[PDB]
Amino acid sequence: KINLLDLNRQQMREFFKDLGEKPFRADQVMKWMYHYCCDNFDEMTDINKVLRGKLKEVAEIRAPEVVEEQRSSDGTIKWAIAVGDQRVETVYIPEDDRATLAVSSQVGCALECKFCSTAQQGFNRNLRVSEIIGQVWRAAKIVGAAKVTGQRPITNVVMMGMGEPLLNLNNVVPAMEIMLDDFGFGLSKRRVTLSTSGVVPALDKLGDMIDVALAISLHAPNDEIRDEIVPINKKYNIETFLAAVRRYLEKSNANQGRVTIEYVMLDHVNDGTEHAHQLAELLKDTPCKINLIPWNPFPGAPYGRSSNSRIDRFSKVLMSYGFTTIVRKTRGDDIDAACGQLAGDVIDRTKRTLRKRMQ
Template identity: 60%
Template sequence: MEAFFLSMGEKPFRAQQILKWIHHQGVDDFDQMTNVSKVLRERLSECAEIRPPEIVSQHDSSDGTRKWAIRVTGGSLVETVLIPDGERGTLCVSSQVGCSLDCSFCSTGKQGFQRDLTAAEIIGQVWLAIKSFDGFPSTNKRIVTNVVMMGMGEPLLNFDNVVAAMNIMLDDFGYGISKRRVTLSTSGVVPALDRLAEVAEVSLAISLHAPNDTLRNELVPINKRYPIAKLLASCENYWSKQSDTHRVTTVEYTLIAGVNDCVEQAKELAVLLKDFPCKINLIPFNPFSLSDYRRPSKNAVDRFWKILNAAGFVTTIRSTRGDDIDAACGQLVGQVADRTKRSERHRANYTQTQVLNVR
């Protein structure tokens, strides 16, 4: 931004002024930037624009969760979800149009993959979410207190754009969110995670979902390339490079009935993680079309939690939020011009399975 203004013959401080108007005030009209000269405002209107992504639809859940479908360049839709909880508001932000990883329990992966989102399209989701509540930081109404890169897509496969967007979330001229309140969630792209340790200091969550490589290979196919031991070692390396070495990784574990929710698997998970600094977040599976997986019973979830808790782990059970508008974890479905043809294969396979079940 400073380089842009220098190219116009202006002073570098103009960058700070414009950033504050955009990210502190939510202004997208140069004419409203009253501490900028009229001449410069006219020049900016001629050569630049502030263009947020387009909201196609907005749905509000009975529990207060809000989901937006956002159109990005090329016409595809991605989804963004805000989950309010008292004074806390967590925004789940998408990083890709679709996802290339095809985890078996996630509806996004069933759509295939089109492209990475730009840094502008990623940070634009934060801008739109706050704008929809008229709650920009300058008003002291912090609608978005936490951001999680856990929407559509694998963030580490869109490394440069995700890091650039997170930097704006953290920056004082952006949204000034604490590094503890910006979280990157990954399925385990180990080389990119190792690289992240050199350039970022955000919170880290990993999508584990299985206590051994055999099962995780089925649920999270990227595990065949980067198995659990390598992933955990990469997480430890990440924290060893941070200024605050006392922070821990959040381990996300989606509980699927009859797949990974039995007593033996809970005990195996406790053994696997016994020397790994972490807290565990159990996520009861949220059903969606094209999947025969089932949500586990409350008894199964509680039993799994008790075993981990007794083993000394800080373990939480994620409340299902926004499932009445398909905004719960694993349910995000945009509109993807699938380059991989995976969505067609999943629909065909699912239809064939349903027919066989009926027979």
């Protein structure tokens, strides 16, 4: 069967057209899928029985299943999401004004950032469209669909889970189109954020095919430090990445002329005042919002979390130059906040297979 979660509205309309139906019936079906979090054609009351019969025969609504769940005391929910044999993560982060979902793009990652727990695993495969938007669907359902509960479950989506989004453009863009779509999750392009370590050629391509909010993962004042922290800097350095960001903003207006800059705080690597000064000079031409993220530790990594006093000094240096700097609050401290810890080692795959036999 065709999984309807793989399709955007354009593709959803043409599918129904081959079924012998008028375009807006696809829109009507999407609405049941995303506004009500429905995966059952029998539950769709305002669709005629004939159309309902065609859909059950050739189509399915199969969302990724939750294999594990962790609820924090601050509201943060973290899920291990099954995608065939392997596992990926999805984190729900509730706030006062916003509700943010962290979605994964790939199974593992090939970019080997030394401060990321997914790096040590290595890359396995990219996710399908259904496997990316189905994280949102599944999260929305469990949290509570908009037209079921009355309140939207998810107001903000950030592609900051496992994987590098820009190395999966073919599946990530259509999935984001569904997030943006009114018959999908009806999100503003300000509320859909793609994070990237800096795959420059792909970033130039992203701007030609969609307009969403960009956030860059910088983590360094210079190229000498970033070669160590973020290996892709060896291929596309900071000034090549910054120049690519300006080219994107000339096409994009989701950022409103100001790119988001992610900057993790690692003990005595990139958190002294001398790094803040260098970073201020670096970005003097590029308008931005700087998010200072405290490093969530995990076993194995050769780094420590930066003391909050050093984070304040670092922040105040940048604020003196006139940069808008945000110190991001840590979420899920009582649980595994570290990105990629719940979905653990690769060898569990075999141990899961023996589990199902004696179930």
